Amino acid sequence: PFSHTKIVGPAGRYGARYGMGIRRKVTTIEVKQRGKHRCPSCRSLVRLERLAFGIWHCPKCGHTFAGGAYVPQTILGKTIAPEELKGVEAEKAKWKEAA
Amino acid sequence: PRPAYRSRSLRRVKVKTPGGRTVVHYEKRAKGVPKCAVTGQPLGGMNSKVYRFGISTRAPSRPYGGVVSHKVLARAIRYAVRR
Amino acid sequence: PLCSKWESLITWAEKGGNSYKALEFREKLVECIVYTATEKVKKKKLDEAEELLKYGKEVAKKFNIEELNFHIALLEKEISKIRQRRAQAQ
Amino acid sequence: PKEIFLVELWKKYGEKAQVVRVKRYEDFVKLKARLSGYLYTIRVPPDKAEQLISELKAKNVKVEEV
Amino acid sequence: KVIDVGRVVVKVLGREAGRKAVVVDIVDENYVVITGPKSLSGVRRRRVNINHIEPTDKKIEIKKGASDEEVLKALEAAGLVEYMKERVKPKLFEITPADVK
Amino acid sequence: GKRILVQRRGRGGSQFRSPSWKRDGPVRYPPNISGRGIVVEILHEPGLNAPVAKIRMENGVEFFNYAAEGLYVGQVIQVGPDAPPAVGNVLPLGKIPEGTMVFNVEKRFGDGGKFARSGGTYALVIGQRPEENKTIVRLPSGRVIEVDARGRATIGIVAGGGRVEKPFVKAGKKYHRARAKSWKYPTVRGKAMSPYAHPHGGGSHQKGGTPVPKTAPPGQKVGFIGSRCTGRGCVRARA
Amino acid sequence: IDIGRELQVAINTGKVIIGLRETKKSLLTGAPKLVIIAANAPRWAREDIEYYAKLAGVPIFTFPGSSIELGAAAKRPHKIMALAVVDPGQSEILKLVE
RNA sequence: CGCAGGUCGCAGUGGCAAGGGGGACCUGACUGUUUAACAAAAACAUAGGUCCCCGCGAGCCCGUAAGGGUGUGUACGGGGGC
RNA sequence: CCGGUCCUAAGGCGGGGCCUAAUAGGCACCCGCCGAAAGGGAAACGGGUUAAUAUUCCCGUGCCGCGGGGGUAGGUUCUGC
Ligand SMILES: [Mg+2]
Ligand SMILES: [Mg+2]
Ligand SMILES: [Mg+2]
Ligand SMILES: [Mg+2]
Ligand SMILES: [Mg+2]
Ligand SMILES: [Mg+2]
Ligand SMILES: [Mg+2]
Ligand SMILES: [Mg+2]
Ligand SMILES: [Mg+2]
Ligand SMILES: [Mg+2]
Ligand SMILES: [Mg+2]
Ligand SMILES: [Mg+2]
Ligand SMILES: [Mg+2]
Ligand SMILES: [Mg+2]
Ligand SMILES: [Mg+2]
Ligand SMILES: [Mg+2]
Ligand SMILES: [Mg+2]
Ligand SMILES: [Zn+2]
């Protein structure tokens, strides 16, 4: 399920150091961190750029925003997002009500 | 002088003189070009290599000149026109 | 072509009546053509040099510049010598 | 030092020259007007070179063969 | 259609950016002819890309191929001479890189 | 000598001080911000625990705030009592509705904000006592406190959450973080010392120390300092 | 009303201009009957389309999805900020105005 | 970079340059640090774990005091043990 | 026209103030200044010369800053093309 490794993929740079549990934690976080995400603005499946921890950038639409340390949106952060970017869902709700 | 040349702040240029010798001239690096105040990209018409300060540069013939790019100026003008 | 900005500046200055600027722009256009052609010939990029020299011939016809024809003749003499050496060696 | 290509432009500087130096070659002559600020050089055909030296000596500019 | 003869527009690009003018002719889908008179606002009569002009709400009544003094009497009929002399002032501090991506 | 490391820390040596020249400025509310503002930048700050947003108010005043999660460049935020309780908005605690997640809470109006300032943290607006101009809020520790209703807070939660879940896998990574923070890195255990240098230092089989009272003087007040209890039994009694 | 299927019918049968730039030019110079803008359209494009459509007197419908799902409903494999219905050939797309 | 043929020596990475290898136990996870001048280690540190004092006018520490450090900080935090 | 000289960094000093039995002791405060011959930062290169200096002397060809004169484009209610 990785390019050349079985289970230790992004953590393969660590070799046999630091312990299986530590490397597993790192792999679990990094597979989400370095995967593809839906941009909160343009909704594109893109590899967002993490400029620092908590600072994310979409290369498609140029949306720069604040998110999680290693993932663009945390579980709590999804529920308390700004209402400006949830315009599509509001339109869907009004369409389902009126139709 | 000598530690100032051991530092990499100047360019080490090797040149052959008309006397047949090879010498190293220590020349300044170019100054950075002006950037847009919103996007930070270099401004067109002002991105020529400049090696010292005090050289007057001619801005493009537009309102706000070498301060903002044409994109920012046009969009701001549209917003102000509507507003 | 390469010195079209110089041609446009020459005609714009002449239309505006700036004779001094028109002379300066004519000098700049000649400098553009001759310098670029000479650098091409010194690097032995003869095809680009020949294209530049044909353009310079057209420009000298259009603007009545004798110095352009003289320098083009010198460059074409050099091009002929280079091609003769290439043919002899090959 | 600066280089000029048009004789009409070059004459404006050469007429005010402190000296006009002449260097000759098989195909062309370098004429160098030495002013206070710059040395203006133009390469001309030999016949035009002779005409320009004649005109400069008429205007009483010093001419020297270098 | 919005970009039409007798429409007051503001040039956004070029040297004359921010200056008001009056559309007097239509060339094609890409170009129209504007002359908000050069003595009045500073926009000399010439063609312009429609992407480089921003139409305003205001519009005046004139015929196609109208002249500069025709546009002048139309603007003075509408009372728009000072509005034509005014130049639009952008607010550069508001714009962020999202607006010009 | 004989003075211990915790006693040497208070002198203010360079190895114990914070390099705040590496940061652009304090992240505090200016005293008199009001109206609408524009989020112009989201930046990383060395040694801090969250990304920092730079807000440019409509009247030209610019200030640094901690970025709410989901805040984006070019956003329009509202400041003042009339501001709606949307994310990124700076509102009085008295106006903020109950159950709202805020951050950078001010204990008194005008101090700049004190609580819920780390990445992923937040305070919960529990209640409002308007007759004493107080707001009951739950802090990140779970403690319930009263704050000035005229104070200001930001709606949302602090961005950068989950930063500490990922391990600091090498000592070098913690070294590089410590160089931006104020920590002295690394630390020697007390019992690895000699008796002149630590109360725990000394014997052939070195041992830690039992808790010291709350009245213990400096140099003696190391280890457990007036602890209610210790260990799993203490955690159980706490819960 | 199936917005997606009606937009397919309008594409195949009538005249539907696709793209934000083409929609803006059709609004400025042509006379489209309807404009459809994606719900997640950016602030500048949304206000540009609203201002131009208000000037030209052309109604705007806000599609209840994003640019991607608007393009999917149109059966284009790309995204669509906005489209202009300038001829509803066999579609009922103009009933979305009310 | 390869193929075919011929040919010399004791010796063809011919000098120079240039890993001996393997099995098992104890021990410290590892990289790192240490008694300048008899100890380099199994000692220290380490990431990881856990406990305690603390909501900030805090906790801890320095100063005779004025005052100061942690702090341009705020529990995903500061300090203190193992 | 090569460096210092100028600028600020980490930081430091002085005066006022506050503290102190007191000072030549302390410094959070206010004001000023110092703080880099490797950071930022105006402008010079080639050749020749001496027993010994050489981007410094001489020859040639230039550059920078400040100031002035003439010509010019431009201006002279208003705006350059
Ligand atoms: Mg220097
Ligand atoms: Mg530099
Ligand atoms: Mg430190
Ligand atoms: Mg020991
Ligand atoms: Mg004891
Ligand atoms: Mg003791
Ligand atoms: Mg003991
Ligand atoms: Mg050997
Ligand atoms: Mg070891
Ligand atoms: Mg080792
Ligand atoms: Mg020893
Ligand atoms: Mg030894
Ligand atoms: Mg140990
Ligand atoms: Mg363990
Ligand atoms: Mg124990
Ligand atoms: Mg100084
Ligand atoms: Mg010597
Ligand atoms: Zn995006």
PDB file of all heavy atoms in Angstrom, chain C residues 28-39:
ATOM      1  N   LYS C  28      20.020  54.165 -32.145  1.00  0.00           N
ATOM      2  CA  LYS C  28      19.750  52.981 -31.337  1.00  0.00           C
ATOM      3  C   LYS C  28      19.359  51.789 -32.200  1.00  0.00           C
ATOM      4  O   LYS C  28      19.754  50.656 -31.914  1.00  0.00           O
ATOM      5  CB  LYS C  28      18.652  53.274 -30.317  1.00  0.00           C
ATOM      6  CG  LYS C  28      19.022  54.327 -29.302  1.00  0.00           C
ATOM      7  CD  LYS C  28      19.337  53.713 -27.963  1.00  0.00           C
ATOM      8  CE  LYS C  28      19.709  54.776 -26.948  1.00  0.00           C
ATOM      9  NZ  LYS C  28      21.072  54.556 -26.398  1.00  0.00           N
ATOM     10  N   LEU C  29      18.571  52.022 -33.252  1.00  0.00           N
ATOM     11  CA  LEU C  29      18.188  50.933 -34.146  1.00  0.00           C
ATOM     12  C   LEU C  29      19.395  50.370 -34.883  1.00  0.00           C
ATOM     13  O   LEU C  29      19.539  49.143 -35.022  1.00  0.00           O
ATOM     14  CB  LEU C  29      17.129  51.421 -35.133  1.00  0.00           C
ATOM     15  CG  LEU C  29      17.046  50.724 -36.490  1.00  0.00           C
ATOM     16  CD1 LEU C  29      16.555  49.300 -36.338  1.00  0.00           C
ATOM     17  CD2 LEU C  29      16.140  51.499 -37.418  1.00  0.00           C
ATOM     18  N   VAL C  30      20.280  51.251 -35.358  1.00  0.00           N
ATOM     19  CA  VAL C  30      21.499  50.792 -36.016  1.00  0.00           C
ATOM     20  C   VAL C  30      22.374  50.018 -35.041  1.00  0.00           C
ATOM     21  O   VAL C  30      22.969  48.994 -35.399  1.00  0.00           O
ATOM     22  CB  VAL C  30      22.261  51.974 -36.633  1.00  0.00           C
ATOM     23  CG1 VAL C  30      23.665  51.548 -36.991  1.00  0.00           C
ATOM     24  CG2 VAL C  30      21.532  52.483 -37.855  1.00  0.00           C
ATOM     25  N   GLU C  31      22.465  50.496 -33.798  1.00  0.00           N
ATOM     26  CA  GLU C  31      23.232  49.796 -32.774  1.00  0.00           C
ATOM     27  C   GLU C  31      22.658  48.413 -32.507  1.00  0.00           C
ATOM     28  O   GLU C  31      23.404  47.437 -32.391  1.00  0.00           O
ATOM     29  CB  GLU C  31      23.260  50.619 -31.488  1.00  0.00           C
ATOM     30  CG  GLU C  31      24.368  51.638 -31.425  1.00  0.00           C
ATOM     31  CD  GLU C  31      24.070  52.748 -30.442  1.00  0.00           C
ATOM     32  OE1 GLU C  31      23.087  52.624 -29.687  1.00  0.00           O
ATOM     33  OE2 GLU C  31      24.827  53.739 -30.415  1.00  0.00           O
ATOM     34  N   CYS C  32      21.328  48.317 -32.428  1.00  0.00           N
ATOM     35  CA  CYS C  32      20.638  47.050 -32.210  1.00  0.00           C
ATOM     36  C   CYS C  32      20.996  46.037 -33.289  1.00  0.00           C
ATOM     37  O   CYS C  32      21.507  44.945 -32.994  1.00  0.00           O
ATOM     38  CB  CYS C  32      19.127  47.307 -32.180  1.00  0.00           C
ATOM     39  SG  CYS C  32      18.047  45.866 -32.249  1.00  0.00           S
ATOM     40  N   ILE C  33      20.825  46.439 -34.552  1.00  0.00           N
ATOM     41  CA  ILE C  33      21.064  45.523 -35.666  1.00  0.00           C
ATOM     42  C   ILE C  33      22.537  45.140 -35.747  1.00  0.00           C
ATOM     43  O   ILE C  33      22.880  43.954 -35.824  1.00  0.00           O
ATOM     44  CB  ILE C  33      20.575  46.142 -36.985  1.00  0.00           C
ATOM     45  CG1 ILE C  33      19.060  46.016 -37.102  1.00  0.00           C
ATOM     46  CG2 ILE C  33      21.252  45.469 -38.160  1.00  0.00           C
ATOM     47  CD1 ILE C  33      18.461  46.901 -38.156  1.00  0.00           C
ATOM     48  N   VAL C  34      23.431  46.131 -35.700  1.00  0.00           N
ATOM     49  CA  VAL C  34      24.844  45.864 -35.942  1.00  0.00           C
ATOM     50  C   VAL C  34      25.453  45.079 -34.790  1.00  0.00           C
ATOM     51  O   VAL C  34      26.223  44.141 -35.008  1.00  0.00           O
ATOM     52  CB  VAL C  34      25.607  47.174 -36.197  1.00  0.00           C
ATOM     53  CG1 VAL C  34      27.074  46.879 -36.455  1.00  0.00           C
ATOM     54  CG2 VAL C  34      25.005  47.913 -37.370  1.00  0.00           C
ATOM     55  N   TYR C  35      25.120  45.443 -33.548  1.00  0.00           N
ATOM     56  CA  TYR C  35      25.657  44.733 -32.394  1.00  0.00           C
ATOM     57  C   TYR C  35      25.172  43.291 -32.353  1.00  0.00           C
ATOM     58  O   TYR C  35      25.965  42.369 -32.127  1.00  0.00           O
ATOM     59  CB  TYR C  35      25.267  45.463 -31.111  1.00  0.00           C
ATOM     60  CG  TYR C  35      26.066  46.710 -30.829  1.00  0.00           C
ATOM     61  CD1 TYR C  35      25.529  47.740 -30.073  1.00  0.00           C
ATOM     62  CD2 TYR C  35      27.357  46.854 -31.305  1.00  0.00           C
ATOM     63  CE1 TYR C  35      26.252  48.874 -29.804  1.00  0.00           C
ATOM     64  CE2 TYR C  35      28.087  47.987 -31.040  1.00  0.00           C
ATOM     65  CZ  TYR C  35      27.529  48.994 -30.288  1.00  0.00           C
ATOM     66  OH  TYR C  35      28.254  50.130 -30.023  1.00  0.00           O
ATOM     67  N   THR C  36      23.868  43.070 -32.577  1.00  0.00           N
ATOM     68  CA  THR C  36      23.352  41.708 -32.533  1.00  0.00           C
ATOM     69  C   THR C  36      23.930  40.858 -33.657  1.00  0.00           C
ATOM     70  O   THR C  36      24.326  39.704 -33.432  1.00  0.00           O
ATOM     71  CB  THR C  36      21.828  41.729 -32.595  1.00  0.00           C
ATOM     72  OG1 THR C  36      21.356  42.981 -32.088  1.00  0.00           O
ATOM     73  CG2 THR C  36      21.257  40.623 -31.748  1.00  0.00           C
ATOM     74  N   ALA C  37      24.020  41.422 -34.868  1.00  0.00           N
ATOM     75  CA  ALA C  37      24.588  40.681 -35.988  1.00  0.00           C
ATOM     76  C   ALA C  37      26.062  40.373 -35.761  1.00  0.00           C
ATOM     77  O   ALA C  37      26.521  39.264 -36.060  1.00  0.00           O
ATOM     78  CB  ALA C  37      24.400  41.465 -37.282  1.00  0.00           C
ATOM     79  N   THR C  38      26.816  41.336 -35.227  1.00  0.00           N
ATOM     80  CA  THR C  38      28.239  41.119 -35.000  1.00  0.00           C
ATOM     81  C   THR C  38      28.477  40.066 -33.931  1.00  0.00           C
ATOM     82  O   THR C  38      29.386  39.241 -34.060  1.00  0.00           O
ATOM     83  CB  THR C  38      28.915  42.429 -34.615  1.00  0.00           C
ATOM     84  OG1 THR C  38      28.706  43.389 -35.650  1.00  0.00           O
ATOM     85  CG2 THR C  38      30.395  42.215 -34.428  1.00  0.00           C
ATOM     86  N   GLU C  39      27.680  40.081 -32.861  1.00  0.00           N
ATOM     87  CA  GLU C  39      27.810  39.047 -31.841  1.00  0.00           C
ATOM     88  C   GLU C  39      27.466  37.673 -32.400  1.00  0.00           C
ATOM     89  O   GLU C  39      28.147  36.686 -32.097  1.00  0.00           O
ATOM     90  CB  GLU C  39      26.927  39.373 -30.642  1.00  0.00           C
ATOM     91  CG  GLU C  39      26.972  38.338 -29.546  1.00  0.00           C
ATOM     92  CD  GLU C  39      25.594  38.019 -29.014  1.00  0.00           C
ATOM     93  OE1 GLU C  39      24.698  38.880 -29.138  1.00  0.00           O
ATOM     94  OE2 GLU C  39      25.402  36.907 -28.476  1.00  0.00           O
TER      95      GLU C  39
END
